[PDB]
Structure 1
């Protein structure tokens, strides 16, 4: 029938959802697990500094929200009754890869800086404002991935 909409085109659109959720979950888990090691490592020496030091665990939870937003927007453009050309499937694969690898890199950075920042926080109380600034600079990577995915998502659905 339609030469621009072949029947294998949903495969790439679902691969977009898979990439967007799995790699964002991986980035959030690397940011959460590597940061919590330092948070509990400082707990034997100074236990009173733990409730302030849960910033990177909350910084890395927003990454799964980025991947979740992009996945639930891609999975609402998929239907077995609608047309769904290959251009739309290539766009959804590109959306998924952008969000996933941006959130994976940002989660690695939040994990490294949160570990070494919380462990070197029991010695210097003044080091906390410099941790939060580097953690803000490490979280905008996933936001860039989400912006590119939202533009490609509204660009291929037409």
Structure 2
């Protein structure tokens, strides 16, 4: 029954990472007096990009919860892989949301100062969202290779 904590701890880091990223983007989108030209024109990509991190860990927690049953092979002890899968997806989603919030917090404020850096901030924010896929791919590859 030790494998239930690994499945329950899957989206706990992705939800706090996406909540901290959306709170960092919403806290960084307060300024600065003008909202017609640029905000939100290309600044909403960080909240929608970091929003799928909780859905990836929720889908991985649903797949790991559906894969783990009390009538399968559970006398090994071999149920330690659920903690590595859920913690692996949770650390990747929390690091992706934490990096997405820090990138969106400076990228949202950097657009009002100089308009030429909007393509650069969106270019770095688009590339920074690919960190969370490794925990979901490693969690699905780890869950596919076992029971």
Counterparts of 1:47 and 1:12 in 2: how far apart (Å)?
53
3-state secondary structure, aligned to 1:25? helix
Query: In the superposition, relative to structure 1, how do residues 38 and 85 fare at CA in structure 2: closer, same or farther (>3 Å)?
Result: same
The Cα of 1:84 is off from its aligned counterpart by 2.8
Conserved in 1, the CA contact under 8 Å of 2:43 and 2:108?
yes
Conserved in 2, the CA contact under 8 Å of 1:13 and 1:74?
no
Counterparts of 2:62 and 2:144 in 1: how far apart (Å)?
14
Q: Which segment drifts farther, 45-54 or 14-23?
A: 45-54
The Cα of 1:141 is off from its aligned counterpart by 1.4
The Cα of 1:79 is off from its aligned counterpart by 2.4
The Cα of 1:120 is off from its aligned counterpart by 1.4
Partner of 1:96: 86
Question: Do residues 53 (structure 1) and 43 (structure 2) align?
Answer: yes
What is the TM-score when the length of structure 2 is the normalising length?
0.88
The unaligned stretches of length 5 or more in structure 2 are none
Counterparts of 1:35 and 1:86 in 2: how far apart (Å)?
45
Conserved in 2, the CA contact under 8 Å of 1:30 and 1:108?
yes
The Cα of 1:47 is off from its aligned counterpart by 6.8
Conserved in 2, the CA contact under 8 Å of 1:43 and 1:50?
no
3-state secondary structure, aligned to 1:117? helix
Partner of 2:132: 142
Q: Give me the CA root mean square deviation.
A: 2.0
Counterparts of 2:19 and 2:105 in 1: how far apart (Å)?
14
The unaligned stretches of length 5 or more in structure 1 are 1-10
Conserved in 2, the CA contact under 8 Å of 1:24 and 1:103?
yes
Deviation digits for residues 65-116 of structure 1, max 9, x if unmatched? 1101110100101223333344652121110010001111111111111011
Query: In the superposition, relative to structure 1, how do residues 43 and 53 fare at CA in structure 2: closer, same or farther (>3 Å)?
Result: farther
Counterparts of 2:142 and 2:74 in 1: how far apart (Å)?
15
Query: In the superposition, relative to structure 1, how do residues 136 and 45 fare at CA in structure 2: closer, same or farther (>3 Å)?
Result: closer
Partner of 1:78: 68
Conserved in 1, the CA contact under 8 Å of 2:107 and 2:121?
yes
What count of residue pairs does the alignment treat as equivalent? 147
